Amino acid sequence: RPPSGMVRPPSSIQQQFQYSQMTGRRKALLIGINYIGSKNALRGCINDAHNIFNYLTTYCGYRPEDIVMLTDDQREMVKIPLKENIIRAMQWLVKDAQPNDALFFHYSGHGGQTKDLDGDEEDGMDDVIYPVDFESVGPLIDDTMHDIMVKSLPQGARLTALFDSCHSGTVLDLPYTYSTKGVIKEPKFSPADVIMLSGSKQNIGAMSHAFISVMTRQPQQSYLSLLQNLRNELAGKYSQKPQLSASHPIDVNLQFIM
Ligand SMILES: [Ca+2]
Ligand SMILES: [Cl-]
């Protein structure tokens, strides 16, 4: 699947945005909510963040002191994926964002929405995620995750998001979307290098596990080769398609470097 002559993303302003040369500060915010005790409880979501954590540390050079992990089985009330905890942790990831950084975000939990064909008044806020205290604080909507994690990024900074949740296809309000059903593309900008993986638009945690295994068993991939490999990796055991959303047009033949 890798192209014959694959040139890494061009290290210059394009047309308005700029990519990341994936060498700057490598931070990660990892969220796994299992909703223990509740009548809508889940299993494996906490284990998913662990999987992303140690993969990021081993094959991606992410130091643990740069990684915040919110999981509800922890003991530290600061690290329990409460809404204020999730929000504050998102502000930290994006804080001091500079060109060419390698931020990573991961979420494994409940996805849903308050729907609308396109976003206004229900401004952009169709997709949502549920903090562990969502029953008494409300969900964390599509728009707020844009204002926090995308806007405060300057030109050149890469945020690499990964959603294992369902109904989270446009959960970062990303303008562009790339799929692999005949190579689909599906359209206030930001020059940052924001990309995101998600499924379909309920078996959860499929998208992270396919990603580690696609990137462990073949570390050299293009934006294109990634999506076919994820589709073969998913279409066997899980019914959903990979969706790489983005904040800018991506010539998918470039080298995806994480
Ligand atoms: Ca949206
Ligand atoms: Cl678990």
State how far the Cα of 188 lies from the Cα of 198, in Å rounded to an integer: 23
For residue 129 the two structure tokens come to: 């995620």
Q: Which of 166, 167, 209, 248 is catalytic?
A: 166
CA distances from 248 to 127, 148, 211 (A): 20, 18, 22
What domains are there in the chain, each with its CATH number?
28-246 (3.40.50.12660)
3-state SS of the chain is CCCCCCCCCCCCCECCECCCCCCCCCCEEEEECCCCCCCCCCCCHHHHHHHHHHHHHHHCCCCHHHEEEEECCCCCHHHCCCHHHHHHHHHHHHCCCCCCCEEEEEEECCEEECCCCCCCCCCCCCEEECCCCHHHCCCEEHHHHHHHHHHCCCCCCEEEEEECCCCCCCCCCCCEEECCCCCCECCCCCCCEEEEEEECCCCCCHHHHHHHHHHHCCCCCEHHHHHHHHHHHHHCCCCCCEEEEECCCCCCCCECCC
Give the Å distance between the CA of 43 and the centre of ligand 2.
Answer: 5
- Experimentally determined by: X-ray
State yes or no: is 60 an active-site residue.
no
Give the rounded distance of the alpha carbon of 148 from its chain centre: 14
Give the rounded distance of the alpha carbon of 103 from its chain centre: 10
Q: 200, 232 in Cβ contact below 8 A?
A: no
Q: Tokens 């963040």 label which residue?
A: 49
State yes or no: is 45 an active-site residue.
no
Give the Å distance between the CA of 208 and the centre of ligand 1.
Answer: 21
CA distances from 112 to 119, 128, 130 (A): 15, 5, 8
